[PDB]
Design a binder for this molecule. Structure first.
Ligand SMILES: NC(=O)C1=CN([C@@H]2O[C@H](COP(=O)(O)OP(=O)(O)OC[C@H]3O[C@@H](n4cnc5c(N)ncnc54)[C@H](O)[C@@H]3O)[C@@H](O)[C@H]2O)C=CC1
Length: 405
């Protein structure tokens, strides 16, 4: 009985985390993103050898798809995901990457991946080894890691990021997606240890270590380009994000990009940019219970303007308009901006007005909580058109050219 080794996979939510993922739906979700890119069409003058650090979900996956299927790039991806086992579905990023390798091969594109802690020196060395064997050098490095923790590669100290305001405590309104209630909670201000730790995790040091490793090992091409992703948002999120602990980390990136640009700009006119992207649903949205509410409002407002987008739409335009084209959406500290439609004054004014009106009773009248919930499930391969969720699947989906760290 093959059925002994297969199962019907359904969403299982433990609080705010979906702990299952559907391999067929994840494949279909990747193909939907690829098909968006191929439908919008190729991007000229892009990189042809791309390293994506954090390439398995979210914005890093979108960059990997954009580079490969938009720019025709060979792509080496680094991520940290759990393979499937019998009776135990792997993480969505595992299945996403399996699909990516499948579709890349179909198009005659190289796809190799490294599964392991990108903060460590060993993973950096495995990545260098892979570039040397296969690509010689890479033309572009996407830095798209998101983690709540970082094990320092030298000291071994384990840093945990904090998601707190700075200075004063703040009352943050939010949406509990389990209870489906609007709820306010008071977050205490970050300690200095919490700030320093968040800067260590989501700051720019590891990005810098990556680039200096590739340079020292000589696998960074003359003039190569590198970008790290960031979020600024608008006032509604300023207290906890931009001006809070995680914002102190993102502020470390506007400093680090300058030293990185210095090194690349001497290397055949390469370039480096912090790239600012819009808010989207991700696996850990509810890491701030404010974000499900903000997203539900933002979605409705932007859908009414025809400007709602997800990861792949955002990153495709980042590549076509700014990383490769001559509409480089530059701002005053030299950041590439793709988030301008979210920050539109009238959008933010409308989101603000609705923020003050939303209650337990009018959530579905005032917000796109429906859309938030659907896009959340889509991350894990659920709710996808054309998938037969009644069919058995083997959760142990394997990936060729997957280097296990
Ligand atoms: N709304 C959003 O989610 C926004 C996110 N951003 C930025 O985009 C970047 C990606 O964020 P998301 O797409 O939200 O996250 P994500 O959770 O979807 O993916 C994070 C990636 O990092 C990888 N990763 C995590 N820890 C790792 C480790 N120790 N070693 C190797 N790989 C590891 C994961 O496998 C995955 O590939 C971040 O810099 C984030 O600040 C920017 C704007 C908005």
């Amino acid at each position: 009985g093959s059925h002994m080794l297969e199962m019907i996979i359904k969403p299982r939510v433990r609080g705010f985390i979906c702990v299952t993922a559907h391999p067929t739906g994840c494949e279909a979700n990747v193909k939907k993103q690829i098909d968006y890119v191929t439908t919008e069409g190729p991007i000229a003058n892009g990189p042809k050898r791309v390293l994506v650090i954090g390439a398995s979900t979210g914005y890093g996956l979108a960059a990997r798809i954009t580079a490969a299927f938009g720019c025709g790039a060979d792509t080496l991806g680094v991520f940290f995901e759990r393979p499937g086992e019998e009776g135990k579905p792997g993480t969505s990023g595992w299945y996403n990457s399996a699909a990516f390798h499948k579709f890349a091969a179909q198009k005659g594109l190289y796809a190799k991946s490294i599964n392991g802690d990108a903060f460590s020196d060993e993973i950096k060395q495995l990545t260098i080894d892979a570039i040397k064997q296969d690509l010689g050098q890479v033309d572009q490095v996407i830095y798209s890691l998101a983690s709540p923790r970082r094990t320092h590669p030298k000291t071994g100290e384990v840093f945990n990021s904090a998601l707190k305001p700075i200075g004063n405590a703040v009352n943050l309104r939010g949406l509990d997606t389990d209870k489906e209630v609007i709820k306010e909670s008071v977050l205490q201000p970050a300690t200095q240890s919490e700030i320093d730790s968040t800067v260590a995790v989501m700051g720019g040091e590891d990005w810098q270590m990556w680039i200096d490793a590739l340079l020292d090992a000589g696998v960074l091409a003359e003039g190569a380009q590198t970008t790290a992703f960031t979020y600024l948002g608008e006032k509604i999120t300023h207290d906890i994000y931009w001006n809070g602990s995680i914002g102190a980390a993102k502020k470390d990136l506007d400093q680090k990009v300058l030293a990185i640009r210095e090194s690349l700009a001497a290397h055949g006119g390469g370039d480096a940019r912090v790239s600012v992207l819009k808010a989207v649903v991700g696996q850990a949205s509810s890491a701030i219970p404010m974000m499900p509410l903000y997203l539900s409002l933002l979605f409705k407002v932007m859908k009414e303007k025809g400007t709602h987008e997800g990861c792949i739409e955002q990153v495709y335009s980042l590549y076509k308009d700014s990383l490769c084209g001559d509409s480089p959406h530059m701002d005053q500290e030299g950041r590439l901006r793709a988030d301008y439609k979210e920050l539109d004054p009238e959008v933010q004014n409308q989101v603000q007005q609705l923020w003050d009106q939303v209650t337990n009773d009018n959530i579905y009248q005032l917000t796109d909580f429906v859309g938030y919930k659907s896009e959340f499930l889509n991350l894990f391969g659920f709710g996808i058109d054309g998938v037969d969720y009644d069919a058995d699947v083997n959760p142990d989906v394997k990936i060729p050219n997957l280097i296990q760290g």
